[PDB]
Structure 1
Amino acid sequence: IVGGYTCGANTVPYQVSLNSGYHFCGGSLINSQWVVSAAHCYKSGIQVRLGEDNINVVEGNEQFISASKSIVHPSYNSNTLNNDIMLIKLKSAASLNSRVASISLPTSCASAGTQCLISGWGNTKSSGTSYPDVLKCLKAPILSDSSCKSAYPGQITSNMFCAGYLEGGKDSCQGDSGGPVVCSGKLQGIVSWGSGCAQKNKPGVYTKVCNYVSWIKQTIASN
């Protein structure tokens, strides 16, 4: 997250870290045994880390659970990043409380102008590299589809939305991928892609979760 603020320990209780020997992507806990992330975060051998703040220090609220199965969306296209969503089943159910909690799925899509919370352990610099060890947060609005398509001609599908600031300075970045965009207490987006981080006229692009609710619910019900 560039231009964000330190969330505070366990203030974003649905945020997960995906770990393969190191943190490589975020995700969101949507019930006691399932996480949603970005398909471009797919790899074998994932450990899901819940209850994290400092990802390099054991602080006492963590739960470390290996994945038992990963399901990339059937129509994911790695070249365009259309349908950039995947589900991860945990080998065992997590223990839910105030510091580790699921986030509700949306019943309706969010409209442009709605303010959302984006979080992650990604890079904090738009030029260069500095990775934080504690979770960072950013409040940002959903932008109009017209402005999103004008910033990224020919690249925005119906399964994507833009959020952030056209003036730059505040954005999600590398290492935030897969993490949540939460608006009015519902998971509306997944950190997906952008042209650099925090550049003028190049806001972040997010997977539009409301289009996938049926696929999520059907997949969970049978796996």
Structure 2
Amino acid sequence: IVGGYTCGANTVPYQVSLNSGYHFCGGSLINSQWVVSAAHCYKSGIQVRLGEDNINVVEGNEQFISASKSIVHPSYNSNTLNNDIMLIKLKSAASLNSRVASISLPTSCASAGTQCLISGWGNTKSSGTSYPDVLKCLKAPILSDSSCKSAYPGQITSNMFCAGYLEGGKDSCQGDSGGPVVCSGKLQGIVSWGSGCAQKNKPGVYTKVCNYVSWIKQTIASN
């Protein structure tokens, strides 16, 4: 997260770190046994880390649970990033509490202007590189479809929305991938892609989760 603030330990209790020897992607807990992330975060050997603030220090609220099953969206295209969504089933149910909690799926799609909370352990600099160890937060509005398409001509599908600031300075970045965009207690987005981070007229591009709710519920019900 560039131009954000320190969330505060366990204030984003649905935020997960995906770990393969190191944090490499975020995710969102949507029930005791399932995480939503980006398809582009897919790899084997995933350990899901919940109750995390400092990902380099055991602080006392962590649950470390291995993935049993990953499911990349059937229609994921790694070239266009269309349908950038993946489900991870945990080997055991997470123990749910104030610091480890599922986030609600949307019943309706969110609209441009809706303020959202974007979070992750990604890079904090526009130019150069510094990884925070504690979770960073950004309040960002959803941008209009027309702005998003003007910013990235030829690239924005019906499964994508822009959120952030066309003036730049405030964005998601490298390592925030797969992480949540929450708007009024609902998971409306997944950190998917962008052009650099926090550049003028190059806002963050998010997976539009409301399009995927029936696939998510169907998949959970049979897996």
Same fold (TM over 0.5): yes
Q: CA deviation at 1:98?
A: 0.3
Aligned residue pairs, count:
223
Identity of matched residues, %:
100
Report the Cα offset of residue 7 of structure 1.
Answer: 0.2
**TM-score (structure 2 length as normaliser):** 1.00
TM-score by structure 1 length? 1.00
How large is the Cα RMSD of the aligned pairs?
0.2
Deviations 1:138-188 (A, max 9, x none): 000000000000000000000000000000000000000000000000000
1:30 alignment partner, SS class: strand
- In the TM superposition, what is the alpha-carbon distance from 1:61 to its structure 2 partner? 0.2
User: C-alpha displacement at 1:50, in angstroms?
Assistant: 0.2
CA–CA distance in 2 between the matches of 1:69 and 1:147? 37
Query: 1:99-127 CA distances to partner (integer Å, 9 max, x unpaired)?
Result: 00000000000000000000000000010
Aligned counterparts of 1:211 and 1:69: Cα–Cα separation in 2: 22
SS for the counterpart of 2:35 is strand
In structure 1, what is the equivalent of residue 19 of structure 2?
A: 19
Moved over 4 A (4+): none
Could you tell me how far 1:137 is from its partner in structure 2?
0.1
* Match of residue 153 from structure 2: 153
Aligned partner of residue 219 in structure 1, secondary structure: helix
Determine the structure 2 residue equivalent to 1:143.
143
How far residue 206 of structure 1 moved from its aligned partner, in angstroms, is: 0.1
Matches of 1:204 and 1:179 in 2, distance apart? 12
Give the Å deviation of 1:35.
Answer: 0.1
Q: Matched residues in 2 for 1:144 and 1:161: separation?
A: 8
- CA deviations 1:43-73 (Å, max 9, x no partner) are 0010000000000000000000000000000
In structure 2, how many angstroms separate the alpha carbons of the residues matched to 1:58 and 1:35?
A: 21
* SS of equivalent residue, structure 1 residue 139: strand
- Report how far residue 218 of structure 1 moved: 0.1
Distance in 2 (alpha carbons) for counterparts of 1:47 and 1:111: 34
Aligned with 1:123: secondary structure?
coil
Structure 1 residue 4 displacement after superposition:
0.1
Which sections of structure 1, spanning at least 5 residues, go unmatched?
Answer: none
Which consecutive residues of structure 2, in runs of 5 or more, have no partner in the other structure? none
Partner secondary structure for residue 18 of structure 1: strand
- How much has 1:12 moved relative to structure 2? 0.1
Instruction: State the Cα distance separating 1:14 from its structure 2 match.
Output: 0.2
What SS class does the counterpart of residue 213 from structure 1 fall into?
A: helix
